[PDB]
Ligand binder design. Structure first.
Ligand SMILES: COC(=O)[C@H]1O[C@H](O[C@@H]2[C@H](O)[C@@H](O)[C@@H](O[C@@H]3[C@H](O)[C@@H](O)[C@@H](O[C@@H]4[C@H](O)[C@@H](O)[C@@H](O[C@@H]5[C@H](O)[C@@H](O)[C@@H](O[C@@H]6[C@H](O)[C@@H](O)[C@@H](O)O[C@@H]6C(=O)OC)O[C@@H]5C(=O)O)O[C@@H]4C(=O)O)O[C@@H]3C(=O)O)O[C@@H]2C(=O)OC)[C@H](O)[C@@H](O)[C@H]1O
Length: 342
């Protein structure tokens, strides 16, 4: 038995429906009782920020129910300032017990068109991160089932508490799943995209850029999933599994790369095509303003029973034992939270 508190549709022939998702969300009474919104097929050009606990979105179909907006970090606001990476997100989750089911969320920033622009073109953006979905420090217990997340650089920003992604598609290029959250992915397709702007022999992207605090047990955990190339034009050995993001952070002694953001990405029972070469390093700025490199061997980067052509086993690709693998069950990663849909 499932009932909807509000319905969103493109048609006036439907009847008692909201025209925009933002209006339906805003109509929810203040509080924390479950509020469930059905979103009928259509492309909704909207940016959403969710601040109400226990809010749930259900699309008519993943293929047909789309929430989309185009915003890069370097896109300018009215006051002439940049949106920034966090500010670029199509959907921002800043509440507890959110779920989305059977819908697509896109950042439509046209990265390839941007890169094709002439270097002297003043409209050419340098800050090319364009987030589709952002779970903030305030977000905990966010559940995404049968969802597709679309972007290029920085598609999915997972911060804060626990998020669970199931039966999902996530596409991107550079650092397309990133942040310090506990994010568990199960039965997802992680799609590495073609880079027209990258020379043969150079890196096209990185699936993950975790910034997990060293004291946090779990970061990005990918299980029973598929790491796939968007097309046959995506070269062999063009994508890294992850690189360590140490975010620029304000400390008492200045603003610099966080030394304690020692990210975790663990792949378990996941297929990988041969676009995967292994792990990689990442640079930041230190407390003195010098370039500092953070290395994968110093980070929490592990695999367990990877398969497919990209699943090579070497000293540069650390493997979990059976006993270690048992620490990455849904129960252990998510703790007392069982993700449920209304
Ligand atoms: C806690 O106190 C309050 O309550 C506070 O709330 C308000 O403020 C908000 C927010 O709550 C607060 O945390 C904050 O702060 C800073 C920024 O303003 C904010 O945008 C955000 O920054 C992130 C990120 O944390 C930061 O490290 C930086 O990251 C860049 C880059 O954007 C990012 O994509 C990545 O890039 C890598 C790589 O470095 C790069 O070379 C290339 O290769 O791309 C890579 C990539 O794609 O990876 C994904 O890392 C970069 C880096 O490490 O430098 O910028 C990010 C961003 O722009 O979003 O958090 C910042 C911080 O705290 O350090 O302020 C916010 C705000 O003011 O709103 C706009 C209230 O305003 C305030 O009054 C108070 O109440």
């Amino acid at each position: 038995a499932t009932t909807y508190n509000a319905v969103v549709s493109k048609s006036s022939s439907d009847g008692k429906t909201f025209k925009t998702i933002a209006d339906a969300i805003a109509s929810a009474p203040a509080g924390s009782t479950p509020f469930v919104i059905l979103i009928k097929n259509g492309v909704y050009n909207e940016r959403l920020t969710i601040t109400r606990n226990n809010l749930h979105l259900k699309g008519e179909s993943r293929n047909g129910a789309v929430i989309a907006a185009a915003t890069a970090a370097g896109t300018l606001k009215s006051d002439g300032s940049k949106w920034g990476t966090a500010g670029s997100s199509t959907i921002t989750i800043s509440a507890k017990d959110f779920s989305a089911q059977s819908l697509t969320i896109r950042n439509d920033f046209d990265f390839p068109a941007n890169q094709a622009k002439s270097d002297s073109d003043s409209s050419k953006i340098k800050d090319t991160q364009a987030v589709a979905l952002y779970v903030t420090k305030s977000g905990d217990r966010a559940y995404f089932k049968d969802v597709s997340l679309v972007g290029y650089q920085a598609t999915l920003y997972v911060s804060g508490g626990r998020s669970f992604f199931s039966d999902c598609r996530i596409s991107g290029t550079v650092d397309f799943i990133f942040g310090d959250g506990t994010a568990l992915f199960n039965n997802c397709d992680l799609v590495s995209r073609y880079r027209a702007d990258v020379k043969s022999g150079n890196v096209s992207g990185y699936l993950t850029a975790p910034s997990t605090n060293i004291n946090q047990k779990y970061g990005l955990v990918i299980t029973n999933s598929r790491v796939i190339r968007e097309s046959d034009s995506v070269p062999a050995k063009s994508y890294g599994l992850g690189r360590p993001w140490h975010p620029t952070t304000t400390f008492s002694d200045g603003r610099y790369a966080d030394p304690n953001a020692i990210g975790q990405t663990v792949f378990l029972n996941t297929s990988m095509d041969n676009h995967i070469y292994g792990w990689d390093k990442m640079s930041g700025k230190d407390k003195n303003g010098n370039t500092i490199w953070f290395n994968p061997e110093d980070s929490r980067f592990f695999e367990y029973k990877s398969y497919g052509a990209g699943a090579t086993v070497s000293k540069d690709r650390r493997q979990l034992t059976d006993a270690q693998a048992a620490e990455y069950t849904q129960s252990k990663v998510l703790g007392d939270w069982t993700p449920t849909l209304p």
